[PDB]
């Protein structure tokens, strides 16, 4: 009765996998929006279920070590369109990173090709980002309160409560992160959400601020699980997120479990 589950029921075997059941397509944007640069669009080719959500993802540094390419393929083959931003065009703020993530949206949703305006659902869509870009996750769900989900990763950010946020929100940080450390940008970000709001903090052992930057099991099987959660409120999906998780990788995760 969902009209948004994609996929086959899944498996812990099958979100660790180093790639979902969809197979995937890009387009290449030189720019999506005057003054924010470009980046990758990964779609799911197969269309026999319907239309997708899709999640723009923001790196926080003009850096090759910042990009966020990885993601595209990963979530986009377990069926999302992912928009993956370049690391090209230097940004210095984080509300600067959140209205990248929505320009880059709104370029989804008004001026994509057709092989992607034709698959996406323009009413769900959802933010991640790194660094500042993490920061500018948070941002753009306090200015498109209609967004599905936003995922803050190891995120960094001068303002340290975030009472506005409507929009599910997964915060990952690394515990050894000495650029945004955690005591004094994640947790006290996650703390500030909303108690109601459905949220989760996952901290992975042993990591540094560029762990979101490389193609890592963790982050992708819970950051999957959270979009499905979330931008198709995919139910099958719960059963990865309550109970907390328990993985080796893990060094805390805090949730408003039962979301």
């Not at 979902?20 to 924010?36: D, K």
């Not at 209205?99 to 370029?107: E, P």
């Not at 601020?209 to 963790?218: G, V």
Request: proline share 8%; aromatic share 10%; hydrophobic share 35%.
């Amino acid at each position: 009765p969902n009209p948004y589950e994609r996929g086959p029921d899944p498996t812990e075997d099958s979100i660790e996998a180093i790639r979902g059941p969809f197979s995937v397509a890009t387009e290449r944007v030189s720019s999506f929006a005057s003054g924010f640069g470009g980046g990758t669009i990964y779609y799911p080719r197969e269309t026999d279920e319907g239309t997708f959500g899709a999640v723009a993802v923001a790196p926080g540094f003009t850096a090759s070590q910042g990009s966020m390419s990885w993601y595209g393929e990963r979530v986009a083959s377990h069926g999302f369109i992912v928009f993956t931003i370049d690391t090209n065009t230097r940004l210095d703020a984080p509300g600067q990173r959140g209205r990248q993530l929505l320009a880059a949206l709104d370029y989804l949703v008004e001026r994509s090709d057709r092989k992607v305006r034709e698959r996406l659902d323009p009413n769900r869509l959802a933010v991640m980002g790194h660094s500042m870009g993490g920061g500018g996750s948070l941002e753009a769900t306090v200015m498109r309160p209609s967004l599905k989900a936003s995922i803050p990763l190891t995120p960094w950010h001068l303002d340290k409560t975030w009472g506005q946020v409507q929009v599910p929100t997964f915060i990952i940080g690394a515990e050894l992160d000495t650029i945004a450390p955690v005591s004094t940008h994640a947790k006290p970000f996650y703390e500030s959400l909303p108690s109601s709001l459905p949220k989760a903090y996952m901290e992975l052992c042993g990591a540094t601020h560029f762990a979101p930057n490389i193609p890592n099991t963790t982050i992708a099987k819970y950051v999957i699980s959270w979009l499905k959660r979330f931008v198709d409120e995919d139910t099958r999906y719960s059963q990865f997120l309550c109970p907390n998780p328990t993985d080796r990788a893990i060094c805390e995760y805090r949730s408003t479990c039962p979301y």
